[PDB]
Amino acid sequence: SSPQLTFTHVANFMNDAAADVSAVDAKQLAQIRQFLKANKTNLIESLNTINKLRSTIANLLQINVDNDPFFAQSEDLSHAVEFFMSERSSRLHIVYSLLVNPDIDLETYSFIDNDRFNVVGKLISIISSVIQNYDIITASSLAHDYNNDQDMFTIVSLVQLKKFSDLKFILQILQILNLMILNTKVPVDIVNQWFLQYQNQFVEFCRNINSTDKYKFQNFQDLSYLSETLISRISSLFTITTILILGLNTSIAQFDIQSPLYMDTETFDTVNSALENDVATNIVNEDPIFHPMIHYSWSFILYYRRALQSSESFDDSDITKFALFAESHDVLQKLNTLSEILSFDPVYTTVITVFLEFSLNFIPITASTSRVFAKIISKAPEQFIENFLTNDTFEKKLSIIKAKLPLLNESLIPLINLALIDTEFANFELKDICSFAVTKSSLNDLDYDLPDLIELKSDLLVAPPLENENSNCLLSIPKSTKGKILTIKQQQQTSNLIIFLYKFNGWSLVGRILQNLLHSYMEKGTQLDDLQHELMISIIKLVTNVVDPKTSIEKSSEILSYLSNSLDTSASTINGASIIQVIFEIFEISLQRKDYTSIVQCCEFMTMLTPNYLHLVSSYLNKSDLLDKYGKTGLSNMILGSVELSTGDYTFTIQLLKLTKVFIRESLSLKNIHISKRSKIDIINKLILHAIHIFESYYNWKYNNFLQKFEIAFHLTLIFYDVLHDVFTINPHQKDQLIISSSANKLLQLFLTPMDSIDLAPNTLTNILISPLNTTTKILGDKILGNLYSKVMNNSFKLCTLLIAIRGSNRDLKPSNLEKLLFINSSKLVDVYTLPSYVHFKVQIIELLSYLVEAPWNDDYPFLLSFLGEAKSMAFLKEVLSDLSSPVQDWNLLRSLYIFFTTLLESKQDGLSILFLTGQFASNKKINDESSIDKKSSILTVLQKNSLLLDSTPEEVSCKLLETITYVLNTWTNSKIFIKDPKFVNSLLAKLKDSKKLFQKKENLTRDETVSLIKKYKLISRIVEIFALCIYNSTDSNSEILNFLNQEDLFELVHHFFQIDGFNKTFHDELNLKFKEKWPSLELQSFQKIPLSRINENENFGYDIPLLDIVLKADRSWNEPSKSQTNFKEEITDASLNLQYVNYEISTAKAWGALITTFVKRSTVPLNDGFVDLVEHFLKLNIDFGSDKQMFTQIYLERIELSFYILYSFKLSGKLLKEEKIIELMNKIFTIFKSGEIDFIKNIGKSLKNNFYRPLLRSVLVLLELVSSGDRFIELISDQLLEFFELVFSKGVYLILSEILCQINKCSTRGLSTDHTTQIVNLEDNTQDLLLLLSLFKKITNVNPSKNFNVILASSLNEVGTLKVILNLYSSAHLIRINDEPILGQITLTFISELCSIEPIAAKLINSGLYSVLLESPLSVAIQQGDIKPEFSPRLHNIWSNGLLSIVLLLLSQFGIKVLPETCLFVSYFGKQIKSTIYNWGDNKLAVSSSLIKETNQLVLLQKMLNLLNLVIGLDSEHDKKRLSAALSKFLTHPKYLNSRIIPTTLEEQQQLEDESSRLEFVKGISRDIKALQDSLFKDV
């Protein structure tokens, strides 16, 4: 059936597409909109709804069984409950997503806009219904007691989850309702319903749940503190909703009087009566029914409403009672607490800011009010802050403060508090103060002349604000200063003040006041007044805002200069006077006295001071005692152990972690070279030590605020990952250049530990990974409350993946304990994978599993199937199958699943792979047979289904699908279920044919064009690999691939895939050069990426852009290049794509070569002319020096091999081809073999790279086997053939034999190393000298050579020198023993016979006298000694005997009477062996074989031939022939005697005797040959 979409998946998709709607796939977007248009009423209306355990939980859910079929038949009831919660939350997620961004579906959005207030009323009714059944029925259901205890625990846990989910549901509905009713005119019906159900149901519920004074484990503060945390948010949101319904508007920053509430005279009465009833019955309960904000704002609403009308009647009877109530209930601190609780969303900050701006008119600005305003308003958006600061009422109230400014509590403290709103506003109000107000008890001390206009006739000394009494510092007012005297009460609804106009700076005054406060801080001690202490903290915070990096370094420096003008010069610890030193002294004193607020504020100051002033922070951290110094515990640990571990607040720890993050990032920069490396290294090491100390213990602390625990783990996992990533994934050829290398090494040592280790860092990481299975983590970590937990989790997943990758890249590192922990906790990750509420954690889990499986284990291998089990593995398979087959699917999830399948197929996890492929466990291996795959529960079915959607599927997903298919095909299975339906092969062929976008490839490609080319290459490589496998496994079943390969125009399509021309060496070399003059301290290769794994194959080429951004963040040339300057960012981005392009081009060339090779191997029919054209193309490509740049010289080798085998395949078939192409190929192969990248002449290549010229040698040998090419181009043919012949033969033979001389004696002063055993397998003489050279010699001699060719050959041989090296190698054979026998002489005779076969060479060599020279050798004398028999060395002895007889016979036959004396002396010297053989044959007891018959026939042929061409002992006299004939008559009559005398001494003789014996052939050959020769002799005589 159809899987059908669910609300959770649609909500996840809309969350993904909430940023950019156009960025998502258009078809998926259209299908999502089609789903939305069908479900328009089910979003909200379906929420409304007006065997004992299942009935109890069904009553708990307040929904019928048949209403939820998924809940009905779910085996695990917890899964059904989780699914129902997820669907209920996802409906409102969809509604909120539509409200926030209407562009997702404008048709469904309009369904809400036209029915806005009906939806609002429905939301209020739903909130009331949820509150009604929150505890009335759930508590009764929990109170039930049937039997068992595990069921009771499960029911209790489910009830607690349901209650917390109900609270989260209320929070969600409140968020949506506040979004809807904002800046809208609320009808009086909604107002009445809200003001009725708020008093009737909401406040009592909140108070009852807050105080529960009206199963033991997992019910402590881990549970009770949760409800108190949620109820506070719920009450704050009720307060905000009540404020919004009254008519607050953020567009005008004022209450909307024209709302229907105030135009109705009856609904106004109900609200007024409700507030009056709340006021009049307050004292019974100290907490009012309505928040003091509501009464406090109603006071102003009533005042404005009365002022709009004419009559007022009573004034204080009704207007002022609400104000008095609010003031007596401490409205300001309640407002501050309300602002603090609602900090998660920025809208409520705007609401409170506009409320404060509205209330400005009725509030005089004082110390407490200014403090509250600074605390609240400073977090508002910039536009609302500007609106508040530009208000006319605020300006008028600020002018009064600024009038009489230097009065401490009156004006100075409120102005300092107001300065904490905006930095530019503070600068404007503090830079140019132009008023000085002085109060004096006695007027005699002032010499002023005279109604308020006075003048000063002398200089005046006035003590500055908060000046020490003993200090001599005073402020001087010059004479002739106009003054104004004020002695009357302030005119708003004071002492004798005198105000002079005096232009002075306020920053200097504030700095002097701060120094004075420091002096009293270290004099009195810790008993400083709160007013002074808070003034000090406020001044420190103001300077912190001043020194913020958001300010320009110039103006920050100017302000800090202003702040230090009036400081005392008595201090001399550091030259000059600075406010930074004052704040540092305050920090040290506060650290000594354990003052939490002061240290927190100073740590914030020092955290924000780092980016622009690092030479001060580093110096302080060196001098201060906050960090450990040589075995001495620092002040930070003293505070953490005593103060923070008892109070439960860890603001200082989080501030320290933030400082660590900022310090590391600023130290990695390039503008901080003026700071020494050693200080930075020491400080970074100390900070990393502190961070590691914090990491191993924070998880067991007690937290008053739960979010703080998320704020710590977020900062810890963010520091480790950056340090490890910047070091272990960059700079392949170095390991310690970066300043953070030591910290990275120590972190790697701590995280990766051997098996026996028990270190707590891997345990903490693993505990973080499996957190979502906790109840408190499920509740607090939900996305409704916030997204900090999700960031924590993705950081942890990234860190764990990076650690596994780093370990896997080193063979020396043994398997770590973290991987064993992950293997043990592997069934706890499948649980997270299958959780309905966690669908944004699937890709990361799958990637982690793939990385874990890919890791190599040497000693012992852990099996995933053994850890998961039989039940947990099947659930994983079901979830994976459900994910694979969905109507709408995520591309990232599909890609990750394909990568996971590919990785699992390569690994040794055979059980899991078998389960995934076949759907059944590997334990039942007997089931494996034909049709033994469960089609319903196998990945193969889904692979087949998705393989046909190549056009719709994106190219990455399809290419990885093809990788998985190839891995399935090549090794795991032989039955090709894929090719049963030809649709797959047809789709592959269509993609290959229409993939012709590879035409231009050069015409100034853009970035997107290059990316598309890369993807196309990646797809085509996999396609041709699949085709190669399909054609190889089956010869003729895939007739369509054969037809595609047999087409006429294949060559034009495939010829460009074998050429690699997409690399720009000049571009890649000028970029590296130009990077070292702009920034000479850096080299571009330092930022090169390191490939750690194939799972991250896409991001493995080029340079790291984030690291370059970190290093060069402060450089203008990197960030804002000019028009006349190069753009290094874009060039580096381009250079990273070229490497990937070249890599995939080479891969595609390799795959195409493999496919063509495997096609040519099997084909038997004659090939087309397209392959001749392809061979010509390959040879020309090698002509143009395809390896001069050393561009992956295996392309050269594969081209050579392809050309050789295509040429060789023409021998098996006919292939009648013209001689012109033969000549072209022959000339091109000569030009390849001479000079160029090949190293045959230099003799260096032959010893090492013998594969670069041996295919060429066989190609030359077998290409000449075609029709003889010696007629048409006989001139060029002869010239090229002679050149190639001499160049190969003379040089190779001379060099090989010179090397042999080197191993036997001193050839070129290299040294003498004569020995029986040397080098390996005759170097190349075994193959390169006798397999090819003599064969090509014979081919030329069989090619009808001309006399002029022989003459030129002889001339070249004389120029080189011949047969001297032959005698030298014969002496080598004398001095070299192989298998305890001299075997190198078997080829000397062959070479001699080949040389002597032709007349000119033989005639030229005989003049040098080969006979005596070869006879003088000791082996020749040993052979001449006689008594040589085949019993000793049959094969070799017959070989040399036949060789010498053949050469003697041929020379005698060819040459005339000028050689007869030489032959006569040769046979006289060699006659002893012949006589011994004759005597042995006459005496019998000798093994005679076919070789002996051949030797006897050759001797007989030489005899009478040395006679008639006018000696031979044993054959000259006729008596010898008579005796031989008598012996012949004796033995020829007894074949059985000959068979008995025959002894098989040769393998061929043994084989012949085994098969029907050999006596018949032996006797027949002997009889025929001997009778013929005897008849010839008798006729001649």
Author numbering: 9 to 58, 69 to 232, 242 to 477, 494 to 536, 549 to 1565, 1585 to 1655
Original authors' sentences:
Nuclear pore complexes (NPCs), embedded in NE, are the massive bidirectional transport channels between the nucleus and the cytoplasm. The NPC is the largest proteinaceous assembly in vivo, which consists of ~550–1000 molecules of ~30 different nucleoporins (Nups) with the molecular mass of 60–120 MDa from yeast to human, and are the sole gatekeepers controlling the nucleocytoplasmic transport of macromolecules. As the core scaffold of the NPC, the inner ring (IR) attaches itself to the cytoplasmic, nucleoplasmic and luminal rings (CR, NR and LR), and is directly involved in the formation of the central transport channel of the NPC. In summary, our cryo-EM structures describe in detail the hierarchical assembly of the scNPC IR, which consists of 192 molecules of 8 Nups with an 8-fold rotational symmetry.
Nup188 and Nup192, two of the largest subunits in the NPC, are evolutionary conserved homologous nucleoporins. Since the density maps of Nup188 and Nup192 are not completely resolved in the IR monomer map, we next performed SPA of the purified Nup188 and Nup192 samples, respectively, and successfully obtained the full-length structure of Nup188 at a resolution of 2.81 Å. Overall Nup188 appears to be a cray shape with a dimension of ∼170 × 90 × 65 Å. The Neck domain is at the corner followed by a crescent C-terminal domain (CTD). The clamp, Neck and CTD domains further form a large right-handed super-helical ring that resembles the letter “S” comprising 52 stacked helices. Surrounding the axis of the “S”, two layers of concentric α-helices spiral up in parallel and are referred to as the outer/inner layer with respect to their distances to the axis, which probably enables Nup188, like a spring, to stretch and shrink to a certain extent. The relatively poor density of the SH3-like domain and the tail of CTD represent intrinsic flexibility of these regions, which is consistent with their roles in mediating interactions with neighboring IR monomers. Moreover, the feature of Nup188 distinguishing it from Nup192 is the existence of the N-terminal SH3-like domain, which is composed of several β-strands and loops. The overall S-shaped conformation shared by Nup188 and Nup192 may play important roles in regulating and maintaining the malleability of IR.
